[PDB]
Structure 1
């Protein structure tokens, strides 16, 4: 709908891509070597419509870690297998202000912040071991990606775990406040958490995952039903209000599209009933969002009138 000529739309994406390219500011994350390795010049943009029409430009086949971009995905999985009610007995449904803490009900504010993602992680495939849990999610991500590139970075995982003092603090804190389900191995969940953060994708395979969320839960390149409508709706609501760290407020105001950024430089973008996208460029701004990515998103909406309330 509302394209209506993909061919010409593609020309405008390449133009926006070229415009963003000139934006060289930002700093590449360096709290671990696996992130510092990256070149500030890498810049890719992949699109995947609700039909299955594709289009890439730039470094769209270089693997990078999802990092926080995986948060909305595992949240979607949890809702899908447990439903809205159960999942939210453990995590909130809205944004907070700026810090490590819980809301008035002693629950993480939402699934998009670390504390929430950690709790969400303790809800998935409970009972089985980490290997089975990890495998189960990889299964899911493959279906969301229509079987395209979905790898894993052991180096990232090892570095994330060995330097995640803050996530461990959050871990013990949540355990103290009784935020996990009965009989949870907190340290085991953090391990699972670090692993999920280390899953690798490319702009191309990620854009398909986004397209699945944009297509009411159906993978546009296989037609298969991956996530329940409830799961997709919840995920998009939270991506709309809590997906860009502290820039979420302004992003929702000026762009108005469900999105989720990651420290690796990615930005999982969704245009409901239209397309899925993945912008990637290592240099991040003060807010922690890909500089070229944010610039691109602004241009995209101020060109194709995609804003939620346009």
Structure 2
């Protein structure tokens, strides 16, 4: 047997590989998002991860570089952008931070209220604001997956219902169609695990960009964002994540998870941003194999903030 593999010599990169390959098959127990027809095309068995450190060290494994739409992960960015624009007190008069009346920014109703209060006299201006914030974080203007956007646009009855409800009850500060457009467009913003790992790292460092060496989000906005990820980030599994993983985290229906670990007293003692992708989702709406990866890392590396 002239050709073989090498028998060898602790190591997070090696562990991430072994774990992605072990958790990959479990995708057969979940589904790709159905209520958006464009997301039903995607291959289910995909699993990728990126962990990023403040010194620039990046480790990754699996499908870490495949593009996907941010979906609900964008609720965190629009929420941040709205606080930066309008200030925390104004945003919190219109949106609840608890897991008519205001709604939580991590659910569709509060996220629509948020899009509507972005600054700008049109959907285009609101979006340029949101992209300028996105660009200070990831260093580039985000790409809209227009296929995904248009198929969301034609079938968005539930979101139109809510938006009209919010306008009735005077919790939309903009027109319904204008609001839908902004909201559906942030959802269709593209990224890889790498981009979300970076936003995660920045939040882990209280809005400080450790690559650019700038304060890019105010500290109190970053805190507020993480509190919402910990309490409301994993839909109706947020309590379970807090108890069994213990790391602030945000999922989307395309299969992204953005997670983070703040500086704490090996590995990743300076903190880290985490980007996971696994398009097969569970009954709660969270990436199935991605959730399993994150729980394993958190338990194995003792990442819990508790």
Runs of 4+ in 1 over 6 A off after TM superposition: none
Greater RCO (CA < 8 Å, at least 6 residues apart): 1
Look up the SS of the partner of 1:56 in the other structure. Answer: strand
Q: Does 1:178 align with 2:170?
A: yes
1:44 aligns with 2:48: yes
Aligned pair 1:241/2:241, yes or no? no
Bigger radius of gyration = 2
Query: Could you say what secondary structure the match of 2:139 adopts?
Result: coil
For 1:22 and 1:234, the matched residues in 2 are separated by 36
What SS does the aligned partner of 1:283 have?
coil
Task: Give 1:203-218 correspondences, 5 Å limit.
Answer: 203-218=193-208
**1:98 aligned partner:** none
Q: Distance in 1 between matches of 2:25 and 2:147?
A: 31
Determine the structure 1 residue equivalent to 2:149. 157
CA distance in 2, matches of 1:185, 1:158: 19
Q: 1:109-124 alignment to 2 at 5 Å? A: 110-124=104-118
- Partner residue in 1 for 2:159: 167
Distance in 2 separating the partners of 1:12 and 1:41:
19
Match of 1:301 among 295, 298, 301: 298
- Per the alignment, residue 285 of structure 2 pairs with 288
TM-score w.r.t. length of structure 1: 0.89
Distance 2:242 2:19 in 1: 20
State the match for 1:136 in structure 2: 129
1:227, distance to aligned residue in structure 2 (A): 0.7
Secondary structure, counterpart of 1:206 in structure 2: helix
- Identify which of 27, 40, 46 aligns with 2:31: 27
Q: Structure 2 CA distance, aligned partners of 1:221 and 1:22?
A: 35
- Cα distance in 1 for partners of 2:177, 2:303 equals 42
Alpha-carbon distance in 1 for matches of 2:20, 2:54: 21
User: Please, which runs of 5 or more residues in structure 1 have no aligned partner?
Assistant: 1-6, 96-101
Structure 1 distance, partners of 2:258, 2:15, is 19
Q: Is the 8 A contact 2:163 2:172 kept in 1?
A: no
Instruction: For residues 265-306 of structure 1, give each alpha carbon's deviation from its aligned partner in whole angstroms, at most 9, with x where no partner exists.
Output: 111111123011111011001111111111011101111111
Rounded to whole Å, the distance in 2 between the matches of 1:190 and 1:151 is: 18
CA distance in 2, matches of 1:144, 1:157: 23
SS at match of 1:27: coil
Return 5+ residue gaps in structure 2 as ranges: 1-9, 264-270
- Given that 1:150 and 1:205 are in contact with CA atoms closer than 8 Å, whether structure 2 keeps it comes out as no
**1:17 to partner: Cα distance:** 2.1
What TM-score, normalized by structure 2, do the two folds share? 0.90
Shift of 1:8: 2.4
Displacement of 1:117: 0.3
